[PDB]
Amino acid sequence: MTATLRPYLSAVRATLQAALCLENFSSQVVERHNKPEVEVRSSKELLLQPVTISRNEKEKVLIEGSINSVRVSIAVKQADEIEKILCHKFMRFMMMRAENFFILRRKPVEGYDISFLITNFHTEQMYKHKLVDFVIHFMEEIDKEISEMKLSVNARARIVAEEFLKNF
Amino acid sequence: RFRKVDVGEYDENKFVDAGPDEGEVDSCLRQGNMTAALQAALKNPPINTKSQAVKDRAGSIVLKVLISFKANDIEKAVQSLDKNGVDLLMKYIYKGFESPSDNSSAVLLQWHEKALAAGGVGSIVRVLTARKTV
Amino acid sequence: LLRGYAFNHSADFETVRMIKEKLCYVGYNIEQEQKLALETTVLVESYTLPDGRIIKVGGERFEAPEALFQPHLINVEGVGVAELLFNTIQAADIDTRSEFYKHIVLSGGSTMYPGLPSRLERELKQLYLERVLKGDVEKLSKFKIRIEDPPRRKHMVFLGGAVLADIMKDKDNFWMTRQEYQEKGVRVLEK
Amino acid sequence: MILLEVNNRIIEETLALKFENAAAGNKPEAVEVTFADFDGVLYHISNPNGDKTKVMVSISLKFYKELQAHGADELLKRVYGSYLVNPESGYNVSLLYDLENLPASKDSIVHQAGMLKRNCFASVFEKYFQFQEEGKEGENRAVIHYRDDETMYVESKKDRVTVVFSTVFKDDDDVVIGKVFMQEFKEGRRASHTAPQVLFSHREPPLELKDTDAAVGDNIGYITFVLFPRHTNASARDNTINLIHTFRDYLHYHIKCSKAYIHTRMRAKTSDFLKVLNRARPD
Amino acid sequence: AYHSFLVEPISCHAWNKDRTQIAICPNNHEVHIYEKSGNKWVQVHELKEHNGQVTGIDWAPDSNRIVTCGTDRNAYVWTLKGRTWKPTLVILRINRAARCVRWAPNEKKFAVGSGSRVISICYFEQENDWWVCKHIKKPIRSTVLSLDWHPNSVLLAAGSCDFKCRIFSAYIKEVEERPAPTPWGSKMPFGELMFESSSSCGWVHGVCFSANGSRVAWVSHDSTVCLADADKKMAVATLASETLPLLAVTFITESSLVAAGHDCFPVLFTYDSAAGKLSFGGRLDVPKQSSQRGLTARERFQNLDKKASSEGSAAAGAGLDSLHKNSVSQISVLSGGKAKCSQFCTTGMDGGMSIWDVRSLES
Amino acid sequence: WXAXCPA
Amino acid sequence: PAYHSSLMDPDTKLIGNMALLPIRSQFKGPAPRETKDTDIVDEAIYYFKANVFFKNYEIKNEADRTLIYITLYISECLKKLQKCNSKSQGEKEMYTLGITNFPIPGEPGFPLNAIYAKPANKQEDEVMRAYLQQLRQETGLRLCEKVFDPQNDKPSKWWTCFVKRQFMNKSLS
Amino acid sequence: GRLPACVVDCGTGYTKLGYAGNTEPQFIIPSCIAIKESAKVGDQAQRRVMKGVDDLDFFIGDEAIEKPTYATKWPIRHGIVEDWDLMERFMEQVIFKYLRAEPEDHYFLLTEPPLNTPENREYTAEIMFESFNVPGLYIAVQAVLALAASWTSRQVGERTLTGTVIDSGDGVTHVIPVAEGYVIGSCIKHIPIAGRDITYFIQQLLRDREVGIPPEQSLETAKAVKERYSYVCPDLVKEFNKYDTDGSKWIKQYTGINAISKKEFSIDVGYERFLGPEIFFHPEFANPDFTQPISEVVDEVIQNCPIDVRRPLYKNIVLSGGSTMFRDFGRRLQRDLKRTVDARLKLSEELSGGRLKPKPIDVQVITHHMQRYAVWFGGSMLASTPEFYQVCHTKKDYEEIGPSICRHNPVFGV
């Protein structure tokens, strides 16, 4: 990935590492709470400006910021309709069992592909560099997964065709 | 039909809270002194100005100046700068980075890599926590 | 139970008391909190049962207090605590409405839920905006409310009784003395 | 199921339940049920009148008019004997069982009635094959578009027979999947010896269909199967007819099966992803 | 000198006069006290009547009183009566939350950096047997995260999250007397804004004062360090680097400076005399850490079931002590005051504690 | 009513 | 629970906690003779076929403790009698089981010891000892007359099937 | 000549099947599903991943029992389902082989237990709209279908919407009242004990009280319950001593046939003739958590709803469901409810004196056919109603809003 994806991964990793810093802030607007600030979007005091790391029109990522949480949204490089369908289904099956992850959301941001979430409650009970490493690894392995799914469906079609044609 | 309406019309302050030129940059470009072109591009930032015109002008000029560079003197260009200059640079690259199309990716990525090699994560922190619309 | 746990009505009724005390909380805006719950799973939390069993509760811990403002959830034709308060204040005279609104107390241990004052004040402001000013927000700015929430909201009646007995003990003409009981045509001694 | 069956098991089951208690006296067991099967055709079983001693079965064929115009006198005596009567429901072939007369056979009759749709469908293809076999002047080509908006065309000339398929996909999701499915249909031949040639065409309709008002458009593919006597004789005729008739539902079912297969694969990969993630939690 | 007191994080820490007792918040609705035993630590007491989360503790060198300032909009002043601890209810008139607290050198008043856009100051009263509370709300526009006090106890700096780090002037005539002349200003009455930050430089997470009371320094989320030198004409010095944001402030002497945060290890700074510029000092704590592991035949198969078998606990942060020391919460001092500080301690969000030295390095 | 009493 | 005890008049005496309800027996003990065939053991045997199924028992009256103890001992009696061969052998086994030393209430080795009381004085100790011995002997004599049948001279499967259905999930052992 | 829709009543037990506008569910098959799984050990990172076409190499239905080389694995467990891939495989197999219905040109109605979580319904609806591309879908509780089917008992023309239904199930039996078409949301309780654990208890007792059966053919032996072999009992101990006294005429015998060696084996019938069915009113035998009867639960749920609806509800209790086929069930329930309600009325009258005498509350239990299946006819009438074609969720609704359209529940609202 030295000449194709390495710089993009390095830049996004540095951005995440800088924006992975978090702290606990007692609720300032609603009685007594410590709920995530990014989702609520109550006070502009805590929010930080969004950032994007991208190299092509159809692929993108977004990096948010706040005291309580940092939100990241990705957009995959999908070209053909089969790629879009497979990505949507795979992400949906990932959603259906997102409880064990403790990091992932429950529905992607509108107009974008899957997005993750971090919080001060997920930074001490879990390691720090491991989470960013996993996000990176997912970003790389998505293309492998989609290509493998494509070849699998092609093989299935071939085998069914061969099985039917033999009778003739 | 009650809570439907917002009640968020408060009073507590929800944190209620010099552009660049073109002729000099063009002269530097045609003369070939790319370092002078970049220096002029970074000069006179729109730190205090509320108008999309100057913002887009600065973004376009910095993008055009950066694109023309080659991947041999980028280190020299970055080195001949001050730390505040490096931060302002990185801010400009991030600003123009959203600009898609016209293959404005690779050069920006190399610039970001060099800035990290020199500016460090502190530049990322500063750009992320700067309510200042730059 | 829906979540899939079977519970009795003998002792587990007391078991859920601690879980409600720790995890259960009330919201500020129902829509935003519901969207957060259905879009995220950070609000999930548990508690260690006496037998060591572990249970997950992330969404049920939020809608239970909502019955206070929406008695419809539990088969009651209620109107809501905030709406009831607004109606009661309005039905009174005029000179007393402002004084009642200025001074208000949140008494009782069941009101110790975190976030109830915010929900109540927001609801009252919404009622004032919609049923009086018809959405005129400009005139709504000066309206003021200060909920009285003493730190000792777990026990305040005992304080009142103690202070009353402090000064109402020397004089014997306050109580239903034992002597009056032996007579007929009695009771309703004072009111 | 891999090869979609042709015997509707609903009629088999209901007739088995009826006949297993047939020899139990005056047992009418009034029945009135409506069914549906592939090709968008509706079945109907109902007694003709208050007399429950007779059970009737009917069809609602979409292209029935073509069958009536062609004439199926062969089908009126070969497979179905005297237990066929004029149409009642919608001018479509309807049969009935005479319970008063002793039914000798039990499985053969049920099996014969099970393939009603294909039994009536064959009246045209088998007759065209007979035309080309008998040496009679090549009967005029015909087009048979069934309930689906797509169309079917057949040409029966000397020394060989031809058949072409038109394909239409409704939902945008399955269009590309079906295109991929049929792309490899025209090439898979390394496991078949005595099999016909297969080809796929979508942009350029075959020159045969230019004059015929068959399925013509943009998002419509074409499939043609070349026919030869080595696989269209009196022995290998029923198998070929069953395969071609069950072609559409076969494609559909295997598309859904592939969808389930990919669902299972992604579900399996989620476990690996979770295992990779678990490296972040402490010991 | 690393040590561990609990796996889960710890909110705040407080120490006694002799450095023999410790206060550790277990990140739960209570607070614990740890005491020395030879060269070992062991629990002694267990104080709990607060139904919320504790987020601020402090200790009185002489009064031996402890204050729990946290959630529930309340605050209890603990006092020792024989061999047991008892509470003391206080009233603060808060509606959102309270995070940080701090007593005074003379032990006459304490302040709370409440999250309700207000700063509260309280003093002892024997009349009603209560703790009366005043409020400062004029310039404040957001939450306050750090509070520090001045020897005379009349000047207070309350860092906030609105780009400002401002000194105040609180003087309760009931329990306060006129302070001596100060270079800053006139020691004006309670509830007023003395001066504000020169410009916008990130948020504020800490503040530090000086014995001479002529220099103030604070840190920010923008990887910046400031030093408000009031001896000159309000000379302001600034410095920056590539380090991650700092979350603490303290100095040794009139020129030195110490800080720590998400960098996972201490960072040292210094201030010039007349140049009006700071400098940098790298890893004054120690050169670097080390890493080790083991076979663990059981683990080799246990990890493969959930994680990858070849995986392990090794990390890039092991070499530079950046593996387990997850972030730094705040800082404290050991000996004397902010003059020599022969030793300095720091808190960690990892749930542990550690000590350091300033002379054992011996340059 | 609008002012005074409900109706 | 639902099928709790019965036949307990207030005049009945007690020994610390238990109810010294008379039992009719030809043996000797600190109990009187009741002419009616009805007694504690008869009701216990009558209701044992169902008490085991239930998983709770509220002690409405003091006789509930007697019912619990008698059923608990009957469980062990059935367990030990399943391997019987002759009526004489079964009677011998039941007799040698009655004259034993089982955990007395108020001492270790006794289930649900919390519910029962702890005797303090000396005399009540042997009073309870004799009462429990008499109850055990009467239970043994009562089981042997119905557990066996005139034919096959073996324990009926119907009466030993409940061997594994230990009351309250545990037995004396 | 509009095509009829499709009616399906999925569940833990025998899954009903057939088409709308018909008077008999044509196909009634178990939920048993085959699979070509075997003994791999890596079963938690590749559950199956069957190579090639072996994935579909599995049978279904009654034919799936007699395949002794695969695994019979029931996907459902009292409503909740762990893995739904088997459910999708079963659904495709049924729709294609048995129903032979094209999803793209048909409407499907599905039934789920009231306790089914929103997530399962949302995801099954998503699966349907994605794979089957069904134009319309609709899911509703089975109580109303039973109420509609109950009209056939007598006087169909006489409209009677009020009542209450206590339906059975392989793993769940629920209580749901109806008040003139509108049900009460909060007055619903879920009973975990059902017609399966009863058989578990039967076989557990039998494995010790008798011998002469093989381990494999146990459930076929345990299915004496489905035969005439279980009567309910007003009293428990009375019949216990009746059996322990005579034990000659009341005992029955079994003459089952082995399915392997074709060797006859017989065993007697004992106390289980009544204990099983009696467990319904004494659930404490099986489930220790739920020590609560049924009749008192019925009265409690009927006493937690408005006054004006309490009276007609007691008059209409429907006997629908397989587990309710036990004889004399209605008599016991009616007698118990009458006793408790009369006692409550007498207590209420005692506190306030008066020479009056309120008209006694009438409680009646109705016995009729359709008890085995009361959901299929309801679904048929559901499909036959034109308004169904309008209320059914459409494709475009699922296209961008998502599968949340099917999340509507009768016990939720904000």
Ligand SMILES: Nc1ncnc2c1ncn2[C@@H]1O[C@H](COP(=O)(O)OP(=O)(O)O)[C@@H](O)[C@H]1O
């Ligand atoms: N005649 C019967 N006698 C006893 N039990 C029966 C009888 N018919 C059905 N059952 C029982 O009722 C259960 C089926 O009830 P049913 O509700 O149709 O299953 P489901 O919940 O999947 O719809 C079966 O497990 C069966 O044991």
Ligand SMILES: [Mg+2]
């Ligand atoms: Mg059911």
